[PDB]
Each structure stands twice: as C-alpha cells, then as structure tokens.
C-alpha cells in the first residue's frame, strides 16, 4: 500500500550516499596508473579497485546505523563485503551491448580480456560477466540498486561479526524497505525481491572464487607488490 516516513528517509539517505560516492564522470580515473594491453592490467585495475574501496567505505559510513556499530564490526563487514559491493556498483558502468564496463573513455573500457591480464581466470570472469548481465536485465531502480548494496554490506553472516543481533535487525529494516518499495513503486515487480536476494547468493560465490584467485596473486610478491596498501589491508586476512 504505502511507505512510512522512516522508510522513505532510509531510501533518501541511501540514494544520497551513493550519489556522493559514485562519480558518473569517471574523471578521477586518469589518476590511476594507466592501463596497458605479463599482467599488464594489474596496476590500473588495482588502482581502480583501491579507489572503489574508498568509495564503498564512504558509502557504508552513510548507511543509517552503520556508524553506530563497533569499529571491529564495521571492519568485519567491510572486509568480507567490499569485493561484493564493488561487483554490484560496477553494474552501473556495465554495458550489455559491449559486454564490458565502459567508464567514459576508450582506455577505461574494461573488456573481459583486460581482466585476464590482471591475474584472473575465466573461472571467475565468466560467472562475473553473466552476473552483470542478469543484474543489468533486472533494470533496477536507483533506489533498489542502492538498497541492495546496503543490504549486502549489512549481512550479519560474515566471519568476524560480533554484534550479530544488531546488524541483523539493520538488514531486516532494509529488506522491509526494499520489499515495500518494489510493491508500491515498481510496476510489475511481483518477483523482483526474490530475484535480488538470489543475486546476493550469487555474490557469495563470486566472493569465494575471487578470494581463491586473490590468494594466488598475493602469494607471489612480484605481483602483490603491484597492489595498493588499502587493497592489501582490505582483501588481506588480518583479524
């Protein structure tokens, strides 16, 4: 039937947070180490991911209630979910006609091959690309896209979470907002909520394979040295 002011407020907060941390001009990308097309794209993509991690952190800090988690819990959530949030938010540059992420310039058009030249295999890139395609076809409203990122960040079922109850309740509030939003505002969305929760499951699997391949990278110092300090901290295994 309708949404409450508290719920509508959450949507507004999330949408603003995302506009504040996602720059459609991609003008900052020239400041990364340039793309080169053994492992020639690793410097450029490591910089891209490092920058994106800062952006996800800025997004998280503006999720209602995230700030009020303990610092361990905030780190716990971010360490396990960063690569997933990056995969979600990257859908906004993904194009179906190119099967690539198009970030303004032709030098910042990442086809699948570019990502192979940064150390990954089709065991990751193939599901990643089909994931982007299925997600792009959902034709998500901005509100739904940002709600999913928030919901994904605030999953209590991450290793290292201590205040399980608090985070779960937060995630409950967001799911309720999403499920309500879709009902009232998304014409023909009767099945959209379940399609989105499935993508959260898909992201867990992409996280797993990514962590596998990142391990192989980081165990070769001649490649890990190309990463950034932020990437090493976030994707690393410290507790």
């Amino acid at each position: 039937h309708m949404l409450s002011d508290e719920q509508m407020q959450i949507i507004n907060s999330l949408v603003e947070a995302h506009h504040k941390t996602y720059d459609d001009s991609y003008s900052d990308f020239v400041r990364f180490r340039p793309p080169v097309r053994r492992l020639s794209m690793l410097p450029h993509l490591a910089d891209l991911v490092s920058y994106s991690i800062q952006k996800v952190i800025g997004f998280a800090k503006m999720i209602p209630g995230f700030r009020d988690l303990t610092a361990e819990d905030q780190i716990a959530l971010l360490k396990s979910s960063a690569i997933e949030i990056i995969m979600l938010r990257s859908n906004q540059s993904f194009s179906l006609e190119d099967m690539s992420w198009s970030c303004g310039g032709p030098d910042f058009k990442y086809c699948i091959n570019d990502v192979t030249k940064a150390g990954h295999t089709l065991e990751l890139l193939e599901p990643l690309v089909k994931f982007q395609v299925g997600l792009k076809k959902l034709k998500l409203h901005e509100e739904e896209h940002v709600l999913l990122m928030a919901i994904c960040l605030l999953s209590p079922d991450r290793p290292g979470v201590q205040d399980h109850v608090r985070i779960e309740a937060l995630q409950d509030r967001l799911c309720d907002v999403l499920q309500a939003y879709i009902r009232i505002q998304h014409p023909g969305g009767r099945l959209l909520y379940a399609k989105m929760i499935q993508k959260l499951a898909d992201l867990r699997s992409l996280n797993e394979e990514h962590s596998k391949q990142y391990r192989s990278l980081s165990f070769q110092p001649e490649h890990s040295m190309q990463l950034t300090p932020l990437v090493l901290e976030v994707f690393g295994s410290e507790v």
Partner: peptide, 10 residues
C-alpha cells in the same frame, strides 16, 4: 593492524 581502515572509518 587495519591501520588505513580505522583511519578512513574516522
């Protein structure tokens, strides 16, 4: 550890 993350999280 998590020196950068703490800082960025303020």
């Amino acid at each position: 550890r998590h020196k950068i993350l703490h800082r960025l999280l303020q």
